[PDB]
Design an enzyme around this catalytic site. Structure first.
Site, PDB file in Angstrom:
ATOM      1  CG  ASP A   9      -8.561  -2.368  -4.650  1.00 37.16           C
ATOM      2  OD1 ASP A   9      -9.267  -1.921  -5.584  1.00 37.16           O
ATOM      3  OD2 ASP A   9      -8.214  -1.675  -3.677  1.00 37.16           O
ATOM      4  CG  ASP A  91      -1.164   1.772  -4.688  1.00 37.15           C
ATOM      5  OD1 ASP A  91      -1.084   2.952  -5.072  1.00 37.15           O
ATOM      6  OD2 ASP A  91      -2.086   1.362  -3.958  1.00 37.15           O
ATOM      7  CD  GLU A  93      -2.443   5.591  -3.650  1.00 37.70           C
ATOM      8  OE1 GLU A  93      -3.164   6.482  -3.160  1.00 37.70           O
ATOM      9  OE2 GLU A  93      -2.831   4.416  -3.833  1.00 37.70           O
ATOM     10  CG  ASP A 181     -10.442   0.441  -2.985  1.00 33.84           C
ATOM     11  OD1 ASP A 181     -11.057   1.502  -2.744  1.00 33.84           O
ATOM     12  OD2 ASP A 181      -9.246   0.272  -2.673  1.00 33.84           O
TER      13      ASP A 181
END
Length: 338
Positions: A9, A91, A93, A181
């Protein structure tokens, strides 16, 4: 993608040229960042897309627990998807609100909009962050097996099952960020539809044969039926619980005739077949345990080493572990997690 497949990613942090890391990783599969909030766009998107095979795109959420803000972010994200892909990732976070339910509701609205637009939604995050800010079970209740969790442990760049994030519904695992990643797939993509069915199965004393719509039947050949591969003998009966070497490769037809893919227990021995059904030789790790497998001259062998503490112990096929570990330094073989 299928179980144990890998993918990378990226975002603007990876730049306009990612050919290098894809070569290192050994795959062109990617999930590329498109947007953040309602005003940011990753400038490296087009180049990163051109240079790879995207399986999805992700959005960095900034809506906290505000459902209205979540909706606007999801639309901005959607309006900027550059090509059809199966998955769109949320995503989540950072910037969580103090209310975990509100956070959950916002995430659910975001994912619901992704599903409504015709894509499979994914919730990406870390375990402790997820534990403290949302009720992930409420997400799985609406979107089964939709989690993509990051957990690196030592973050040495390799997949170490010892630190596998323990949570239900994990589809993908981001096992490291060193140097970029890295992710490994835990579940095959869903295909849930209505099997075409190009004939009808017929069972009899000798076994199962397949009568195609036109009356004929497969024999002396492989043939996918209902999405599953089978090998039919010269009489038209598919093989069951049997090894078959074809074109210099070994395949195993399970008790139901279905071609084996992934790990398969033959007798009391474990073998690993790739997604093509072809046996994989050498070292292959299955979660915490290591296996060295060979098929020299058709002699199928599976050497099993069970992990215990900081060591791996050889297990004689007569179920008995050695008193001391055979090795403490893992071999550099194929790592599988499912």
């Amino acid at each position: 993608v299928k179980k144990n497949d890998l993918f990378v990613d990226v975002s603007s942090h990876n730049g306009y040229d990612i050919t290098g890391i894809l070569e290192q990783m050994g795959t062109t599969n990617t999930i590329i960042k498109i947007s953040e909030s309602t005003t940011y766009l990753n400038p490296c998107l087009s180049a990163q897309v051109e240079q790879s095979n995207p399986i999805g795109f992700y959005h960095f959420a900034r809506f906290g627990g505000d459902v209205a803000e979540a909706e606007r972010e999801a639309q901005f994200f959607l309006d900027n998807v550059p090509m059809q892909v199966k998955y769109l990732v949320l995503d989540y976070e950072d910037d969580p609100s103090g209310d975990a339910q509100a956070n959950t509701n916002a995430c659910l609205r975001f994912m619901q909009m992704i599903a409504d637009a015709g894509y499979k939604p994914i919730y990406y995050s870390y375990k402790p962050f997820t534990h403290d800010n949302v009720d992930y079970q409420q997400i799985l209740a609406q979107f089964p097996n939709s989690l993509w969790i990051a957990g690196y442990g030592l973050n040495d760049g390799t997949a170490n099952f010892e630190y596998f994030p323990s949570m239900d519904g994990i589809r993908w695992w981001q096992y490291s960020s060193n140097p970029f990643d890295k992710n490994i797939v835990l579940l095959d993509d869903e295909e849930d539809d209505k099997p075409k069915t190009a004939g009808t199965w017929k069972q009899d004393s000798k076994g199962w044969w397949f009568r195609r719509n036109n009356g004929s039947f497969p024999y002396n050949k492989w043939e996918k039926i209902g999405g599953v591969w089978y090998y039919f003998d010269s009489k038209g009966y598919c093989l069951t619980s049997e090894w078959l070497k074809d074109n210099e490769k070994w395949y195993y037809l399970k008790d139901n005739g279905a071609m084996a893919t992934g790990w398969v227990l033959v007798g009391s021995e474990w073998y690993y077949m790739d997604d093509s059904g072809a046996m994989v030789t050498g070292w292959v790790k299955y979660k915490n345990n290591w296996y060295y497998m060979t098929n020299e001259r058709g002699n199928m062998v599976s050497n099993e080493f069970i992990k215990s503490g900081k060591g791996w112990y050889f297990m004689n096929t007569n179920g008995e572990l050695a008193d001391n570990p055979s090795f403490t330094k893992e071999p550099d073989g194929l790592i599988t997690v499912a």
